[PDB]
Design goal:
PDB class: four helix bundle
Assembly: tetrameric
Entry title: pLI mutant E20C L16G Y17H, antiparallel
Number of helices of chain A: 1
Oligomer: homotetramer
Largest sheet of chain A: none
Keywords: four helix bundle, antiparallel four helix bundle acyl transferase
Strand content of chain A: under 5%
Order of helices and strands of chain A: H
Number of strands of chain A: 0
Chains A, B, C, D: general control protein GCN4
């Protein structure tokens, strides 16, 4: 379970990064 | 055409935030039992 | 409870694949004009 | 423009990675 939970938190944190990137791209366009 | 793409990006990053919230919920549940 | 979480992960999977397809579409459009 | 495209390709790349990871996790929980 700890590996699953740590992987979901990794994916979480990358999804947040992806949302920030798409926000940045939207503003440039 | 550009306004359509900007609005689609806003939609996707909204859905992306929702997905992340759903995964955080799942992570919480999986740690309890 | 576990079956519910597995089914939700399959929903999220599907939605993430759809999102990627949408972004690939956007990437195509933005390179044309 | 090339910067934007290359970032979108990085992102959807990583999205495919995320989907494979979630598919792996679903299988593990199926136990």
């Amino acid at each position: 379970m700890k590996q699953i939970e740590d992987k979901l938190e990794e994916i979480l944190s990358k999804g947040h990064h992806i949302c920030n990137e798409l926000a940045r791209i939207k503003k440039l366009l």
